[PDB]
Amino acid sequence: LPILFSALEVSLRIKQNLHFCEAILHFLFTLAKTHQGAAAMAGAGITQTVCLPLLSVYQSWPGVYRLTVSLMERLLKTLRYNFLSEALDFVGVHQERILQCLSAVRTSLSCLEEADHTVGFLLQLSNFTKEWHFHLPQLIKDVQVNLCYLCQACTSLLHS
Amino acid sequence: QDFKNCFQEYIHNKDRRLSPTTENKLRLHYRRAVRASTDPYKRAVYCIIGRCDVSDNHSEVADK
């Protein structure tokens, strides 16, 4: 994992080896099903590595981002308490992109999958709504608002 | 005013270290809280020390 994350950091920095990034991300997500696995994954500072460069991708690629979000959600589901801190950190970083994914569902299959992943991450985080509103008070509130909006959007798109 | 040793490093003391995370925590908090702050002095100073927010001319605090 040390050399791996060093590589991934380099890669996202230069924005290369997309297939490599995605495959490694999938391998990580598969390892993350395990308690000890995700435990070491955090112990690797997977956040400390990925969170910073991941801005570059938005500043396959969206597939890699989605897989990363999936790994984050699964990691929360695996070790909520000790990982909520880093989860909130990354979210505060990836907040704008999560909002964009939740909003794109109006205007596309890729928008759909991105919204689904952002929503799954938000769900995994919801189990700690206390600390969520505690640290990021604007976040949880704007989240509930837009979530009502998007549930309505889904209902309207589906009914007709 | 371990934050004191950190600042003594920042201003005067060179203070190289072993496997330390430096300027990572500054920029993160800065973008987390400082960037939105109304205090042009505080924001500009954080920008200077943390060497981020490149486009921030902070002109409200610098006019010449």
Cα B56-B60-B64 angle, rounded to 5 deg? 90
Please give the C-alpha separations between residue A72 and each of A82, A117, A145, B64, in angstroms, as whole numbers: 13, 10, 23, 47
CA nearest to A156, candidates A99, A105, A88? A105
How was this structure determined? It was done by: cryo-EM
Note whether B28 contacts A89, CB cutoff 8 Å: yes
Distance from chain centroid for Cα A63 = 11
What's the reported resolution, in angstroms, to a tenth? Answer: 4.2
Query: Are residues B47 and B53 in contact, defined by beta-carbon separation less than 8 angstroms?
Result: yes
Nearest Cα residue in chain A from B31: A93
CA B24 to chain A, closest CA, distance in angstroms equals 9
Residue A138, exposed/middle/buried by CB under 10 A (0-12, 13-18, 19+)?
A: exposed
Query: Are residues A56 and A15 in contact, defined by beta-carbon separation less than 8 angstroms?
Result: yes
Pick the residue of B19, B21, B23, B28 with the most A CBs within 10 A to test the interface with A by mutation. Answer: B28
Count residue pairs from A and B with Cβ separation < 8 A. 5
Neighbours of A96 (CB within 10 A): 11
